[PDB]
Amino acid sequence: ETYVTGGSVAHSARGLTSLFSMGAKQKLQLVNTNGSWHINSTALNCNESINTGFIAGLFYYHKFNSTGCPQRLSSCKPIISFRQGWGPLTDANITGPSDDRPYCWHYAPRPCSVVPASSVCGPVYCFTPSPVVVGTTDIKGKPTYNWGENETDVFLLESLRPPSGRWFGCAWMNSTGFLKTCGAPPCNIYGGNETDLFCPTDCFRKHPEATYSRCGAGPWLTPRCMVDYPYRLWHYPCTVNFTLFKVRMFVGGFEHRFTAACNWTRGERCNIEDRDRSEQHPLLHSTTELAILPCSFTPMPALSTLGIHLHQNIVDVQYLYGALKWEYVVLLFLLLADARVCSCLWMMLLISQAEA
């Protein structure tokens, strides 16, 4: 039976919180719009503070009328559906209309340019692996000079890859409540019935070295897991059901720690092919057990030896705790032979190779 150990779930992180007792009055529910399913932005208070939004997200665990969520998610595809990849990576060129629904894990965004705050509701979140909030500054002052009309305090992101730039990608909702995100260019894996995946994240199974650091640009680490943040339920509705995990990234030399949610349910077939690469780092750095994303692994070989050791029935666990007898025997035989010159040569060879 496939299950987890360290999986923390926030579906009922509440008790006797009936002081509000009803959605804290900012009802969050999906509606259809000419065959399109987004959040009902009408009631959906917009100009709140960070603490008010934090309380609102705190009270949202149960009242989710997830009715149209399946048919909305029908647009998304599993990683299997795409075609193979090969060759050296290239940087894609996202242009023209993007008919794809952005909430899918594999949505290629446009480069993060300027954006007027007159058409955004809620905070805007950039996703240097540890999520961050982005503020504003008045457009009327700077020569940015009126992308719209009498607007003020436009957001600007304009970031390169986080090792050089500031963040991978950022997300928000526009005024009508539709998800809108941008990010760094993703990886094309073909230039050098199915569809060509543009790999906005760690598409390990479809391309070997397309790691998150090189390719990923956005909230998605694996096609199964994502980085959590206070407005995660805000921006992405359907991912309510997810379970949290502890993550240590270590991107760009610096250290990054945060939480991650996942498309995980007990009993999912996860034999060997449903494993995705993700660069983790030890949290406690001991006990030889690593809490890793479910249906995943990390490229850190074990202590004594190499070869990733993973448990059949629990996927979140990464195992550790899985010598030159020949050379020592040869050296001892040489010593018995008393060939000191040969003994000295063997000692030098061991120092160069065995000892080094």
Ligand X SMILES: *[C@@H]1O[C@H](CO)[C@@H](O[C@@H]2O[C@H](CO)[C@@H](O)[C@H](O)[C@H]2NC(C)=O)[C@H](O)[C@H]1NC(C)=O
Ligand Y SMILES: *[C@@H]1O[C@H](CO)[C@@H](O[C@@H]2O[C@H](CO)[C@@H](O[C@@H]3O[C@H](CO)[C@@H](O)[C@H](O)[C@@H]3O)[C@H](O)[C@H]2NC(C)=O)[C@H](O)[C@H]1NC(C)=O
Q: What is the longest distance spanned by two Cα atoms in the chain?
A: 94
Instruction: In whole angstroms, give the CA distance from residue 214 to residue 259.
Output: 21
Residue type, 178: F
Take residue 270 and report the two structure tokens written for it.
Answer: 């996860």
Closest CA to 296 of 313, 320, 272: 272
Four-CA torsion 330, 334, 340, 342, nearest 10 degrees? -60
- Alpha-carbon distance of 97 to 94, in angstroms, equals 9
CB of 318 to a second copy, least distance (A): 12
Region of 42-50, 144-152, 156-164, 305-313 interacting with ligand X (CB under 6 A):
42-50
- The residue from 271, 286, 287, 352 that contacts ligand X (CB under 6 A) is 271
- Min separation Cβ 252 and ligand Y, Å: 28
CA separation for the pair 132, 166 (Å, rounded): 11
Asked if 195 touches ligand NAG (CB under 6 A), the answer is no
Among 5, 8, 33, 43, contact with ligand X (rule: CB under 6 A): 43
**Interacting partner of 27 out of a second copy, ligand NAG, ligand X, none (Cβ under 5 to 8 A depending on kind):** ligand X
Interface residue with a second copy among 161, 180, 205, 224 (CB under 8 A) is 161
By CB under 8 A, residue 345 contacts a second copy: yes
CA angle at residue 336 from 335 to 341, to 5 degrees?
A: 35
Residue 5, contacted partner among a second copy, ligand X, ligand Y, none, CB below 5-8 A by kind: none
Going from the C-alpha of 99 to that of each of 72, 93, 104, the distances in angstroms are 14, 15, 12
Interaction between residue 42 and ligand X (CB under 6 A): yes
Cβ-in-10-Å burial (0-12, 13-18, 19+) of 15 comes to: exposed
Q: Which residues bind ligand Y (CB under 6 A)?
A: 36, 66, 69, 73-74, 76, 119, 174-176, 178, 180, 238-241, 263
Sketch the per residue contact string, 8 through 27, with ligand X: x for CB under 6 A, - otherwise: -------------------x
191 lines the binding site for a second copy (CB under 8 A): no
The partner residues of 310 in beta bridges, in order of sequence, read: 318
CB nearer to ligand NAG: give 1 or 99.
99
Site for ligand X in 46-75 (CB under 6 A): 65, 67
Q: Which does 119 bind (CB under 5 to 8 A by kind): ligand Y, a second copy, ligand NAG, none?
A: ligand Y
What is d(CA 171, CA 233) in angstroms, rounded to the nearest whole number? 13
Rounded least distance, CB 180 to ligand NAG, Å: 20
CB 217 to ligand NAG: min, Å = 15
* Min CB(22)–ligand X separation in Å: 10
The strand ranges marked E within 58-147 are 90-91, 120-126, 132-134
Pairing, β 289-291 against β 132-134? unpaired
Residue 208 in the binding site for a second copy (CB under 8 A): no
Helix (H, G, I), strand (E, B) or coil at 71: helix
Cβ–Cβ < 8 Å for 98, 110: yes
* Inter-residue contact 121 to 41 (CB < 8 Å): yes
**Of a second copy, ligand X, ligand NAG, none, which one sits near residue 93, judging by CB under 5 to 8 A according to partner kind?**
ligand NAG
Q: Which of residues 87-126 bind ligand NAG (CB under 6 A)?
A: 93, 95
Residue 141 per-residue DSSP state: T
The residues that touch a second copy, with contacts defined as CB under 8 A, are 8, 10, 13-16, 89, 91, 161, 163-164, 209, 211-214, 244, 250, 252-255, 259, 279, 284-286, 299-303, 320, 341, 344-345, 348, 351-352, 355-356
